[PDB]
Structures are given as structure tokens and as C-alpha cells.
Amino acid sequence: SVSKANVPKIDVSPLFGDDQAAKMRVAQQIDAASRDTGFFYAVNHGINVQRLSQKTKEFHMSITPEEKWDLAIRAYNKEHQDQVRAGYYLSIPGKKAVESFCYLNPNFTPDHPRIQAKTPTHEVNVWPDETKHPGFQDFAEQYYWDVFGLSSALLKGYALALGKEENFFARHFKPDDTLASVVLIRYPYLDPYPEAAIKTAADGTKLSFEWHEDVSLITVLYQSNVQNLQVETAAGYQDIEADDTGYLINCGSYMAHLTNNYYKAPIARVKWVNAERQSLPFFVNLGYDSVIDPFDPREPNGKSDREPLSYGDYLQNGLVSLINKNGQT
Ligand SMILES: CC(C)[C@@H](NC(=O)[C@H](CS)NC(=O)CCC[C@H](N)C(=O)O)C(=O)O
């Protein structure tokens, strides 16, 4: 028998305002949730989520094989050596069900010095033909900045929760240099569903994606209304109920590092479900040279002996390790 995770629904709208005590009352709830299962739903968040699923499904349904190859990351097309992160992630019929499209900071252009320097984890986005996908690039770039705004406010909530000034995290989260990414993920309905795309967990649960900590500061996720996620607790894996108006929020391993494990990075997995569904994570990554000084809010003097980690190298390491562990998505 599988239990259900405590995932509180937190009205985050005060984090956009100027009522500081109201922000503290949000921060308290973020602290509580981060110390419990590690997940909460952000509600009253102001993002129009009503068509995100439709647009994601329709883009994947309508993009042709030729277009997928043309946009494909290096793992699927050796001609695209510069596309490590951004671009199309093809399914493999009979073997791999999921397909997805990842894009980065729209401000990463050939003019950007990190592109000029060929710094790892920085790439220029690739986009399909506008006339074949009218409005898609516009929608996607706008969505990036919409979720950027929400994420900056959430980061104020996390900073207050930890006893810091509200810009402790968000001052490192900037449009000119953020390594944050959006992934537009389609999980298809398949009949018959290929068993090779299903992994069996140690506890016997059929899965589409194995256990992992997120590589992020925090993760800001919209999913369509099909229950799939589970979070690991000491009592075992627990189901995360879907909420296809709220945003599912949790800390990544960078936050676990800098708080000296006071806010752990929850371990989650994706159960296999034979259902058309859409999943849109926004990974809140900082700049390549962003460094946050660790602290230990469990200690009277607040001091941590842990090394400040440069975020870019953390991201570099984290993305490769997740591929090595859980497979190329
Ligand atoms: C909701 C999650 C479980 C989602 N999975 C995911 O997004 C998984 C696990 S967090 N994430 C990744 O593979 C990292 C993608 C990083 C991205 N290509 C980039 O370069 O920045 C899913 O639906 O599979």
C-alpha cells in the first residue's frame, strides 16, 4: 500500500507584494513544507497555465521526423556538437516513450560573452520553422520570463524562510546570465505500451523515470492533471497528487548543499501511467559564476564548513551524472 505525501497548497501571491509580514507568513509555510516532504504547490501564482498542456501536446504532435532530426540534441544527431542541452529529445518507438524539447535563456545569443567564450552549459536556442509552428517561439520565450518572475518571488520566500534578507537567492537569478531551462515534455498514450520503456523499481513499482534528486536551486513544475510523481520519505515512496492549476515546487541539490542539509533535496520518481500527459519543468539555475556561501541554520552561530560551490560547475556535473544514472532522456 502506498500513502499520499503531504503537499500543502501555499498562496504565494504575497511574495509579489510589499506586505512584509504577509511574506513572512508565506515563508513559514515554505519552511514547513521544505522540512516535511520537501514539496509544496504554489497557488495564486498569476501564470496563465490554461493552454500550456495543449500547446505542449500540439507542438509534439505536429512536429515531423525531419524537423525533429533538424532540431535534435547531440545525443540524437552527431552533426549538432554544440547542442548538449537545448533542442529536441526524440522518442524511440518501442524503447523510449518520452519526447521533449528543451530551451535556455533567450538572451544567450551569438553576442553573449559566454557563447563567444564557448563556456560549458551555455548554448543558443534552436527553434522550429515559424510558419510550421506559428506563435510557438513567442509563446515559449514569454513563458520563460513568466515563470522567471514567479521563480524570483519564490526565491524571496525561500530566503526569508531561512532567516535571510529576501534577495539572498534572487540577486543571483538574473535575465542576463541565468542557466535556467524549460523542458516541454510529452508522455504519450501507447497501445500496446512497450515494456522496454518501463523500468521496475526495487519495490516493484512500474516507472517511467527512476529516483533522482533535482539538479537545480529549486524546481518550478507545471504538469497536466495526471498523477505520476512520488516522493521518497523514510516511510517509503508517497504519491504526489496532481494539481493542474498549481506549480509543484521543491529544492534541488544545490539548496541542500548551501543550507548544510537543513532543506534536503527530496528524491522523487515518475510512475509509469499509460496516458497522454504533459510535463513542463522550469529549473531555477543561477549564473555560471554564481556562488552562494553555505550556512547551517541548525547551528546557533549559523556557521557551515562547506565549500561555496560555483553554480555552473555544479550544473555541468549534475546534468552529466543524471544522464549517467537515469539514462539519456
Ligand atoms: C517532472 C519531472 C519528473 C520530469 N523529469 C525531468 O525533468 C528530469 C528529472 S527532474 N530532468 C532532467 O532530465 C534534467 C533536464 C535538464 C535540461 N535538459 C537542461 O539542460 O537544463 C518528467 O516529467 O520526467
Ligand SMILES: [Fe+3]
Ligand atoms: Fe526531478
